[PDB]
Design a protein around this ligand. Sequence first.
Ligand SMILES: */C(C)=C\C(=O)CC[C@@H](C)[C@H]1CC[C@H]2/C(=C/C=C3C[C@@H](O)C(=C)[C@H](O)C3)CCC[C@]12C
Lengths: 237, 11
Amino acid sequence: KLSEEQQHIIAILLDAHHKTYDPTYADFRDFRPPVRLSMLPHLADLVSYSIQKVIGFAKMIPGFRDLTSDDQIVLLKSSAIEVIMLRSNQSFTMDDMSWDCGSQDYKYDVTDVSKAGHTLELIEPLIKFQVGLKKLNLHEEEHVLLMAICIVSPDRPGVQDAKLVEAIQDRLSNTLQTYIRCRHPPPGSHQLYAKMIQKLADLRSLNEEHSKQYRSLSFQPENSMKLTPLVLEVFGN
Amino acid sequence: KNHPMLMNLLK
Ligand SMILES: */C(C)=C\C(=O)CC[C@@H](C)[C@H]1CC[C@H]2/C(=C/C=C3C[C@@H](O)C(=C)[C@H](O)C3)CCC[C@]12C
């Protein structure tokens, strides 16, 4: 059965996502306009804005505060791109195979990403990942728990206090496992926790691929200038 | 830590 603390955790995670994710996408106006590396300025802005929201969600996560400032920073730096890919799915649509943000201008497709300077090597696994995630058809409760588990991972590069990080994650993991049995009906439930954890492995690969893609883009200064200072700090540095 | 903006946002 789902313990009150577990229910408490879920309620917090939902509210935190609600605070940090605006389904109206009204802030997108502020970004540099999309041009159809024409897309890089607009996408760099979207990514940077997203990093800010991922941080805001991360603070909300139970037990996250208890971590030392250095461990919090390493966790965000490594996980930020993965969370953006994970969170981005709410936008993502099977019909177009594109991320849809309520306007044609703000609807993003493979050629747009490519215009950002990303090769199919990143993009193709990315779209399959989006497709597989959508197929899971997770409860919002599951979606928010998965983002929280992604962030608080003990094997992230630079982690000081893995045991403490592992302890925060396990409580979330146990909440997820217990939620699915209690609140997710068969046949959707079948092998759901394992499928979700497989998505986290997919994400590590995507992150590893993204880094190589960033490094190639990064190597040229003129391309680097287009990025935001947050983006340079999180991925560079 | 060499991460001023991330550290500030975190606080
Ligand atoms: C490489 C130099 C530039 C990049 O754009 C790197 C990341 C690219 C490859 C994609 C990762 C996720 C993609 C998208 C996400 C969409 C949204 C993010 C989310 O936070 C949100 C609020 C909305 O759901 C939109 C689609 C565009 C390409 C990516 C940024």
